[PDB]
Design a protein around this ligand. Structure first.
Ligand SMILES: CCCCCCCCCCCCCCCCCC(=O)OC[C@H](CO[C@@H]1O[C@H](CO[C@H]2O[C@H](CO)[C@H](O)[C@H](O)[C@H]2O)[C@H](O)[C@H](O)[C@H]1O)OC(=O)CCCCCCCCCCCCCCCCC
Ligand code: CLA
Ligand code: CLA
Ligand code: CLA
Ligand code: CLA
Ligand code: CLA
Ligand SMILES: CCCCCCCCCCCCCCCCCC(=O)OC[C@H](CO[C@@H]1O[C@H](CO)[C@H](O)[C@H](O)[C@H]1O)OC(=O)CCCCCCCCCCCCCCCCC
Ligand SMILES: CCCCCCCCCCCCCCCC(=O)OC[C@H](COP(=O)(O)OC[C@@H](O)CO)OC(=O)CCCCCCCCCCCCCCC
Ligand SMILES: CCCCCCCCCCCCCCCC(=O)OC[C@H](COP(=O)(O)OC[C@@H](O)CO)OC(=O)CCCCCCCCCCCCCCC
Ligand SMILES: CC1=C(/C=C/C(C)=C/C=C/C(C)=C/C=C/C=C(C)/C=C/C=C(C)/C=C/C2=C(C)CCCC2(C)C)C(C)(C)CCC1
Ligand SMILES: CC1=C(/C=C/C(C)=C/C=C/C(C)=C/C=C/C=C(C)/C=C/C=C(C)/C=C/C2=C(C)CCCC2(C)C)C(C)(C)CCC1
Ligand code: OEX
Ligand SMILES: [Cl-]
Ligand SMILES: [Cl-]
Ligand SMILES: [Fe+2]
Ligand SMILES: [Mg+2]
Lengths: 341, 504, 36, 37, 33, 167, 34, 34, 38, 81, 30, 63
């Protein structure tokens, strides 16, 4: 019972918001990430890094505000406030996009603090640490998208800017430049997300519709008691319903709930790997056999060749303003267009 | 019985068979390295290190042999293309043979250790249970690691007993294996300084010797022993995987950004050298130095080496490839045969135009020609009806200086447009697309492929760290929570401190 | 302890939220960001 | 030599067979287009 | 179509290798007592 | 063809800027989150019924009457991960929330498409921010519009004879 | 009988104090003209 | 810069007013903890 | 010499140590004053 | 159940609202004045509606040099006068 | 060969559906 | 278990399983080295990053 054990006593007190040792990392890093985002979206411009207004103070709404990435000439600079770019000037640091790296780094260490908190509480309450393990998927996504992706690219400029429309641009950029929908790792991510949402909806509806009558109310929530040993719904009835509707059904509740962990976690991990490839421009952009055939046969058309024409439109129309460090002047006659439009 | 994903857990309390499984893994990795090297040797074309180097040929292990000194073949060639040198035993074939023989010897040792699993050395002498003193094992292995790290730096890399390492000039023109002196200043932490690599292995190896001695002699604190579960071998696996993902993220970054350990003559240029126009500026510098001294434009550009012009071409950028565009870079654009020479574009008014280069993001890019102040003077238009800057309208011609088309001038607009579509890629080269059935579609270099594998593997290894670390610290609840879990422990307001029964 | 009834608190707090968000939607049609 | 006591039987039930074969065949259905390119 | 010449064997082994791994493990499970 | 439908739909309707698609995204992201959350929390609180050399799923028998996990322990964990009143202690309320969140969101996503069918499109903030002189100050919404224009002008590149794509 | 300043008090005020400051700032922004 | 006083003027006059009403009860919480 | 970014490094190192040192001194001090009842 | 006072008890008490009917409007008015005095522009460097461009400037003042970026912004700001 | 491959895998999936539904391990109440 | 010639030589090196030092031991020394290692990693990170620029340290292929 030295000073360490006395400090360990206080950090793990049963209070309203648990602290723990992880709370030393989680709480300041998460609050600065959140507070940095709310600060930038309320007050900070993107005029010098992107040529964009991006705060409420400039006139943007909630959908259009962002803490935008630094200028492409920053490279992968950490953009520390005391670093050689800002040199301690907070105002210049904000104008250089120093808030973006502030949010991304405090957010990264905050996420590390959150998984440590999951591990710490699970160890203290005596449960298995599967919630910490499932949280590795959001960590893999944040690390691949906001860190590994721009680190493979020219600068932090091409990471997502922390904002709603800014994120939508990032989606459209990945379509037009990376053809990211064609990527099988993204497709595995889509199956994990939509499968997990299916599993969320299907499991919740099945439980709620195979409930045992454990009370007289027509509003059935009161008939559950948190200390009951018994199942509140009929696994046998649920199993027979789905076996006859759909052909298969869960018969093991433990496997069912593991599969609910597995599906969206595996999906997000799969999507992270595809983005790691896109950090190097290792895209699933084309199918070579279709390109050889289309180049020699001008009647050969698929939805895939149609999507590449859309991709070429996206690149030529968006690049001069989306990449204003390149100083793209595309004269109007060079622009790919269809007839009339 | 055991589920399929837990079959290897039979080794957890069996040090003899853990060693056997590790020996078999080591036999497989060493056998891969030999068989990979023999495959590469069977396919590598050594005849042109200027325009067909190893990094154009999908060579993966060949640069790793070349980085540390192995440059010759028993068949008589070297990777720098020099003639008539003798490599001794340690050629590329001799490395590959050494790895194969080592693979077989490790296989036999794996068999022995698998059969003779029940050795007395693995037993605790006070209980007769299987017991490994993992803290002392760490100090022994750290001591051995530091000895080898020191020896690699002090003897191999310095040339004192050993070949040295691959070093090159800033433009990757004149690289060779050379002995490297250690840099003990702050420039030893410059990743582009080879002398810092020598001083690292000397200093860190000495530190590894001292720390290994410490860990041999000093027992763990019981606070650290109990908290890190130092009697459970899975704690070592968890932290080893953590160290291993850290190192893989490091090697991915230094491959992608370039360092003294990732030479462009071995792995290809970086994407950042295209981004910053690193080779184009040195090409233009040398041309202006010649033109200031009275060389003509033909003479100034004919003095640029083909190897330097080849780096200034986007088909050597490691960021132009595709995930399923498989194989060597030569499978894409073809085998580079010759520099065509530098294209100079001029309008009918005689003013020089400049083709806007393709950035690495763009699978396709329009052809736009600007003057020296960035104003657009010519282009290849999409819609033609209101076009004002067509090559026909502006009378655009192209002249070549240096290379194959030196002195030649072209004026017919299809021919001038076609070289302009090539000039978006940088310097224009003549390719052999027929030998490999080259499809014309850019592929990444070994620098690109190494970076992708090692970043993906490092990311997946982060899951393994989390998984095995969770398995270590929560070993008591791995098969489930205590069925007599006190609800007071998990209900609020019973214990002062969470999960402490003494605080009730 | 319990001097102002919680339904009064919730109603006034819920109405001030409406007023402030309502001002934000008003500001979408006036001044900065309104395109005029 | 006496048997190794660390040995354990291995299982894979039928549902796990069906799940794994579903996973392998769907992954092959997904990736085969990219393997053919 | 001019497809990858290794694509057929890459697909065939991608199926057959882990499929037979599961078949081996399943059948030896059923033959247990 | 699905991806072609999506890209053209964004070009013509700006679906990303429609709040019903955004509610739809919150449905599926939330559904995937809550799937992983409910799966992990139940798996974390499974009652020990098996040894180390067996799958924990064998600890559950089909049709058994006792619950196979400790919901009080799971609530005790999750109520300490966030705070106590953010965590469900009622499994019926929990499972209704698991049904209700993805379903309502996907309902809204369906009404997104179905009302963009009648060309009530996502939010248009093109040229919404204007300086003191009148210069357009671009936002991220104007960058979205530049991408939308490139999709618009290229889609069905032979099908339009007149300058507006009216359906 | 209860305390007044706890960790929970700090956690509440680190969010609520800047939130009310920001809402006043954003309200003022609705009256700026170009 | 006169405005840093103006922006902090209500923040100051709120804290000192809140700590005026809470000082008889903030001392009693400090006393039983001490 | 001490370049400006080397001075910036020492400022960033000291500022971090001050933030870590003040926080741990506050957390230790509160822990010693409000102990557990065992 | 962790010892702190319930939120329903606090926000319904008169003493909470005696304190907070001053503190809550004071923080709101302080935020209002941070914008209305114009301090938010000076602290954050955000352009006012008349200071995005010079009077005949159509070009965006994009930062193009990493280590002279602080000086470029300052130069861009001196170009507005 | 490509079309054969894709149809083959598809037919194996559909066969797997048949065995997974009609030759499943029967869920047993115990 | 099987005694061997090499096994009996290596025997002292695998004899002190579970042997610990009392209490905190050399933990405060270890934390000092971890702190120095963290600072060392930050130095080499910021040199490579161009955040820390030192005289005579040109982080470029030009060297
Ligand atoms: C897992 C879960 C764990 C939980 C997450 C924890 C989060 C911690 C947060 C870490 C913060 C990371 C900062 C990395 C900055 C970086 O790298 O910054 C980049 C710098 C290198 O700088 C870049 O270098 C480039 C190459 O330049 C070189 O080439 C140029 C062209 O010739 C010039 O010559 C130039 O002078 C010369 O230096 C360009 O200059 C770029 O502008 C410049 O940004 O590296 C350096 O600082 C260091 C490089 C070595 C360390 C790399 C390890 C980390 C990277 C892993 C990701 C690999 C990404 C590959 C993608 C796949
Ligand atoms: C757990 C809390 C935590 C963590 C992990 C971080 C982490 C970070 N902060 Mg944040 N920050 C925090 C709390 C935290 N912060 C708080 C509470 C505030 C409000 C004061 C801030 C305000 C803040 C600002 C304004 C900035 C950061 C920045 C950063 C990043 C760089 C920090 C750095 O390089 O210093 C290095 C310091 C250390 C690593 C401490 C070393 C301790 C060693 C082990 C002991 C040795 C010290 C030695 C004795 C000192 C002697 C000096 C002498 C030699 C001259 C890093 C991600 C920067 C950023 O976000 O970049 C965009 C930045 O600009 N932080
Ligand atoms: C017996 C000695 C021996 C020697 C001299 C070689 C020599 C070689 N190997 Mg072979 N190899 C060996 C055994 C050996 N090998 C064994 C046993 C295996 C099976 C594991 C292999 C598997 C193998 C593969 C797969 C490959 C090689 C390759 C090579 C060539 C390049 C080496 C290289 O780039 O490594 C680089 C080595 C490092 C970067 C070492 C990193 C050390 C880490 C960072 C230590 C981290 C932990 C450490 C303990 C921390 C504490 C340190 C302390 C000092 C403080 C070189 C000819 C390459 C090749 O060209 O094949 C044809 C290659 O691809 N080898
Ligand atoms: C004077 C003696 C001396 C000299 C000249 C060197 C020289 C060097 N050391 Mg060495 N070193 C020495 C002594 C010396 N060392 C001693 C005594 C030790 C203790 C045993 C070390 C331990 C050590 C380590 C651990 C490392 C070096 C490295 C290096 C190289 C640094 C440049 C570089 O490429 O970094 C590039 C590496 C970095 C900039 C480190 C990045 C740290 C990361 C960012 C931490 C975050 C990790 C986390 C997983 C990231 C996840 C997020 C991500 C996905 C975005 C350089 C060769 C580094 C190296 O090997 O590079 C190839 C390296 O990692 N040294
Ligand atoms: C670190 C690993 C590594 C790297 C970076 C390289 C790099 C290279 N190899 Mg080598 N090689 C390696 C290991 C590696 N190799 C191994 C282990 C073998 C034995 C199989 C080989 C055998 C080999 C041969 C025979 C050849 C090469 C060639 C090459 C070159 C071209 C690469 C290419 O086209 O890949 C293409 C990469 C892909 C198409 C990516 C694969 C993606 C997989 C299939 C996706 C998996 C998805 C997964 C199943 C989903 C899981 C979901 C689930 C978790 C739910 C390149 C330099 C070629 C060369 O040019 O040599 C001269 C060549 O002919 N390699
Ligand atoms: C040094 C690396 C290392 C080592 C020695 C181990 C060792 C172990 N792991 Mg761990 N693990 C690791 C890294 C490692 N892991 C990584 C990187 C991940 C993230 C991918 C994991 C995630 C993980 C999980 C989720 C589980 C384990 C489990 C285990 C235990 C049983 C393994 C088994 O029976 O699988 C047998 C494997 C098969 C029968 C077939 C696997 C085929 C894979 C999916 C694809 C083919 C792999 C290919 C052949 C090899 C390429 C190697 C690559 C590195 C290049 C064993 C202690 C299990 C455990 O803890 O049990 C109690 C367990 O459930 N591991
Ligand atoms: C035991 C049995 C094992 C069975 C082997 C299974 C074979 C199927 C394996 C998948 C096939 C791989 C597809 C490549 C198709 C092909 O043609 O390649 C063939 C290519 C070679 O490329 C060939 O090269 C030739 C001349 O060398 C010609 O150029 C040919 O045109 C070109 O196809 O070979 C490689 O792909 C082998 C190296 C793979 C490099 C791995 C990079 C690391 C990727 C890590 C990603 C992991 C992500 C994990 C996600 C979870
Ligand atoms: C409106 C949507 C209706 C809510 C139900 C939709 C989910 C269906 C899920 C699959 C069935 C799931 C299922 O089986 O549910 C069963 C569940 C419990 O059923 P009981 O039998 O207890 O009650 C239903 C009746 O019998 C009344 O007692 O029903 C409810 O909880 C109904 C709640 C009505 C609540 C009033 C409506 C308020 C909804 C507000 C939420 C919308 C806010 C949106 C803002 C963006
Ligand atoms: C009651 C069960 C209903 C099922 C709950 C599941 C859905 C819950 C919805 C989400 C929460 C909604 C609000 C609950 C609505 C509700 O049920 O209220 C009840 C709850 C407690 O009420 P009282 O405090 O009056 O009751 C205390 C009891 O002891 C009664 O004596 O109110 C709150 O917790 C107020 C929330 C303020 C939040 C202060 C947070 C401070 C910051 C903490 C953030 C840090 C943690 C982050 C860790 C990284
Ligand atoms: C960055 C930085 C920092 C920090 C700061 C911070 C931390 C801040 C915070 C801040 C904050 C913390 C703020 C807040 C804000 C708030 C707001 C802005 C709010 C709003 C709200 C609203 C608007 C609402 C709405 C809604 C929802 C959401 C849902 C439901 C419905 C309703 C409608 C109600 C420092 C100095 C350290 C350093 C330098 C940098
Ligand atoms: C016995 C003996 C011998 C022999 C030996 C030998 C001959 C060996 C060989 C060996 C070898 C020959 C081996 C090899 C190995 C290999 C391996 C181990 C591989 C692996 C692979 C993998 C792992 C891969 C994977 C993948 C794929 C498939 C696809 C893509 C992705 C990846 C890359 C992942 C001698 C006489 C000398 C001596 C005495 C005895
Ligand atoms: O079809 Mn199918 O996508 Ca409905 O917009 Mn009008 O049309 Mn055509 O154009 Mn745009
Ligand atoms: Cl289309
Ligand atoms: Cl029409
Ligand atoms: Fe459930
Ligand atoms: Mg307005």
């Amino acid at each position: 019972r030295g000073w360490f054990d006395i400090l360990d006593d206080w950090l793990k007190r049963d209070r309203f918001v648990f602290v723990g040792w992880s709370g030393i990392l989680l709480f300041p890093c998460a609050y600065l990430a959140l507070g940095g985002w709310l600060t930038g979206t309320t007050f900070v411009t993107s005029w010098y890094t992107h040529g964009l207004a991006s705060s409420y103070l400039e006139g943007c709404n909630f959908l259009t505000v962002a803490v935008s990435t630094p200028a492409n000439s920053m490279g992968h600079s950490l953009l520390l406030l005391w670093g050689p770019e800002a040199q301690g000037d907070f105002t210049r640091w904000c104008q250089l996009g120093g808030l973006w790296t502030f949010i991304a780094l405090h957010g990264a260490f905050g996420l590390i603090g959150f998984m440590l908190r999951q591990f710490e509480i699970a160890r203290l309450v005596g449960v298995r640490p599967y919630n910490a393990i499932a949280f590795s998927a959001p960590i893999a996504v944040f690390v691949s998208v906001f860190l590994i992706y721009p680190l493979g690219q020219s600068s932090w400029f091409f990471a997502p800017s922390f904002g709603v429309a800014a994120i939508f641009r990032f989606l459209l950029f990945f379509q037009g430049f990376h053809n990211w929908t064609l990527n099988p790792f993204h497709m595995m991510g889509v199956a994990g997300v939509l499968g997990g949402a299916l599993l969320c909806a299907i499991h919740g509806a099945t439980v709620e519709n195979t409930l045992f009558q454990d009370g007289e109310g027509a509003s059935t929530f009161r008939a559950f008691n948190p200390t009951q040993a018994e199942e509140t719904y009929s696994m046998v009835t649920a199993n027979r319903f789905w076996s006859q509707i759909f052909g298969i059904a869960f018969s093991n509740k433990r496997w069912l709930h593991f599969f609910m962990l597995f599906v969206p976690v595996t999906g997000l991990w799969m999507s992270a790997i595809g983005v790691v490839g896109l950090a190097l421009n290792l895209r699933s952009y084309d199918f070579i056999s279709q390109e050889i055939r289309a180049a020699e046969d001008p009647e050969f058309e698929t939805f895939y060749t149609k999507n590449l024409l859309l991709n070429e439109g996206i690149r030529a129309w968006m690049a001069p303003q989306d990449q204003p460090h390149e100083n793209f002047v595309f004269p109007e006659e060079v622009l790919p267009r269809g007839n009339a439009l | 019985g055991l589920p399929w994903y837990r079959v290897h857990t039979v080794l957890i309390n069996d040090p003899g068979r853990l060693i056997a499984a590790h020996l078999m893994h080591t036999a497989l990795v060493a056998g891969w390295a030999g068989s990979m090297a023999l495959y590469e040797l069977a396919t590598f074309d050594p005849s042109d290190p200027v325009l067909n180097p190893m990094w154009r040929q999908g060579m993966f292990v060949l640069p790793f042999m070349a980085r540390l000194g192995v440059t010759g073949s028993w068949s008589g060639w070297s990777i720098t293309g020099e003639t008539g040198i003798d490599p001794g035993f340690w050629s590329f074939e001799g490395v590959a043979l050494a790895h194969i023989v080592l693979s077989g010897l490790l296989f036999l040792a794996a068999c022995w250790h698998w059969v003779y699993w029940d050795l007395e050395l693995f037993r605790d002498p006070r209980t007769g249970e299987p017991a490994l003193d993992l803290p002392k094992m760490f100090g022994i292995h750290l001591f051995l690691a530091g000895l080898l790290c020191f020896g690699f730096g002090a003897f191999h890399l310095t040339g004192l007993f050993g070949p040295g390492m691959w070093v090159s000039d800033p433009y990757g023109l004149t690289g060779s294996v050379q002995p490297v002196a250690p840099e003990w200043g702050p420039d030893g932490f410059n990743p582009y300084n080879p002398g810092g690599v020598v001083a690292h292995h000397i200093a860190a190896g000495i530190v590894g010797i001292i720390a290994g001695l410490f860990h041999i002699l000093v027992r763990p604190p019981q606070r650290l022993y109990k908290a890190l579960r130092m009697g459970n071998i899975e704690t070592v696996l968890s932290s080893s995987i953590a160290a291993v993902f850290f190192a893989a993220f490091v090697v991915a970054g230094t491959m992608w950004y370039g360092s003294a350990t990732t030479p462009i003559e071995l792995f290809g240029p970086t994407r950042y050298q295209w981004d910053s126009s690193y080779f184009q500026q040195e090409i233009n510098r040398r041309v202006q130095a010649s033109l200031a001294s009275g060389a003509t434009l033909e003479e100034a550009w004919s003095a640029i080496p083909e190897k330097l012009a080849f780096y200034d071409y986007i088909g050597n950028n490691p960021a132009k490839g595709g995930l399923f565009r498989t194989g060597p870079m030569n499978k894409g654009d073809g085998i580079a045969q010759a520099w065509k020479g530098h294209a100079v574009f001029r309008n009918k008014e005689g003013e020089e135009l400049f083709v806007r280069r393709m950035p690495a993001f763009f699978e396709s890019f329009p052809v736009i020609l600007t003057d020296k102040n960035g104003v657009v003077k010519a282009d290849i238009p999409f819609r033609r009806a209101e076009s004002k800057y067509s090559f026909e309208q502006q009378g655009v011609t192209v002249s070549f200086y240096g290379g194959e088309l030196n002195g030649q001038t072209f004026t017919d607009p299809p021919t001038v447009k076609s070289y302009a579509r090539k000039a978006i890629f940088g310097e224009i080269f003549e390719f052999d697309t027929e030998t490999l059935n080259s499809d014309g579609i850019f592929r990444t270099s070994p620098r690109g492929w190494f970076t992708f594998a090692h970043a993906v593997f490092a990311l997946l290894f982060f899951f393994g760290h989390i998984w095995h670390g969770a398995r270590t610290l929560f070993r008591d609840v791995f098969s489930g929570i205590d069925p007599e879990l006190s609800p007071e422990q998990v209900e609020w307001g019973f214990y002062q401190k969470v999960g402490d029964v003494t605080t009730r | 302890g319990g001097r102002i009834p919680l339904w009064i608190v919730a109603t006034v707090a819920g109405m001030g939220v409406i007023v402030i968000v309502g001002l934000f939607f008003y500001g979408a049609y006036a001044g900065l960001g309104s395109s005029l | 030599m006496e048997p190794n006591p660390n040995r354990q039987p291995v299982e894979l039930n039928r549902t796990s067979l069906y799940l794994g074969l579903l996973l392998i065949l769907v992954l092959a259905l997904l990736f085969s287009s990219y393997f053919f390119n | 179509m001019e497809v990858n010449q290794l694509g057929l064997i890459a697909t065939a082994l991608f199926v057959l290798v882990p499929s037979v791994f599961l078949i081996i493990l399943y059948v030896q499970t059923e033959s247990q007592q | 063809g699905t991806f072609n439908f999506m890209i053209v739909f964004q070009a013509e309707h700006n679906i990303l800027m429609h709040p019903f698609h955004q509610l739809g995204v919150a449905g599926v992201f939330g559904g995937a989150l809550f799937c992983a959350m409910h799966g992990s929390l139940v798996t974390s609180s499974l009652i020990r019924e098996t040894t180390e050399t067996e799958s924990a799923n064998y600890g559950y028998k089909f049709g058994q009457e006792e619950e196979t996990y400790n919901i009080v322990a799971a609530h005790g964990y999750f109520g300490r991960l966030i705070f106590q009143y953010a965590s469900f202690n009622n499994s019926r309320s929990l499972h209704f929330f698991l049904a209700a969140w993805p379903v309502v969101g996907v309902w809204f996503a369906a009404l997104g498409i179905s009302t963009m069918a009648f060309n009530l499109n996502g939010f248009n903030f093109n040229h919404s921010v204007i300086d003191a002189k009148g210069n357009v100050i671009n936002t991220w919404a104007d960058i979205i519009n530049r991408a939308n224009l490139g999709m618009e002008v290229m889609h069905e590149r032979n099908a339009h004879n007149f300058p507006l794509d009216l359906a | 009988s209860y305390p007044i300043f706890t960790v929970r008090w700090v956690a509440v005020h680190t969010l609520a104090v800047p939130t009310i400051f920001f809402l006043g700032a954003i309200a003022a922004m609705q009256f700026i003209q170009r | 810069d006169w405005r840093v006083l103006v922006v902090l003027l209500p923040v100051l006059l709120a804290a000192g007013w809140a700590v005026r009403n809470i000082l008889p009860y903030a001392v009693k919480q400090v006393q039983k903890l001490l | 010499t001490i370049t400006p970014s080397l001075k910036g490094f020492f400022i960033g190192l000291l500022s971090g140590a001050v933030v870590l040192g003040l926080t741990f001194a506050v957390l230790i001090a509160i822990s010693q004053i409000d102990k557990v009842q065992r | 159940t962790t010892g702190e006072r319930p939120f329903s008890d606090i926000i319904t008490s008169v003493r909470y609202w005696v304190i907070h009917s001053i503190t809550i409007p004071a923080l709101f008015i302080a935020g209002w004045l941070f914008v209305s005095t114009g301090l938010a522009y000076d602290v954050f460097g955000t352009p006012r509606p008349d200071s995005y461009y010079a009077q005949e400037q159509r070009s965006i003042p994009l930062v193009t040099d990493r280590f002279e970026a602080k000086q470029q912004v300052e130069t861009f700001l001196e170009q507005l006068k | 060969m490509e079309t054969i491959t894709y149809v083959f895998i598809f037919a194996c999936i559909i066969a797997l559906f048949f065995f997974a539904i009609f030759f499943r391990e029967p869920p047993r109440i115990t | 278990a099987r005694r061997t010639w090499l096994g009996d030589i290596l025997r002292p090196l695998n004899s002190e399983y579970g042997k610990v030092a009392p209490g905190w031991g050399t933990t405060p020394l270890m934390a000092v080295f971890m702190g120095l290692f963290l600072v060392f990693l930050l130095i080499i990170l910021e040199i490579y990053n161009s955040t820390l620029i030192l005289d005579g340290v040109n982080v470029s292929w030009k060297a």
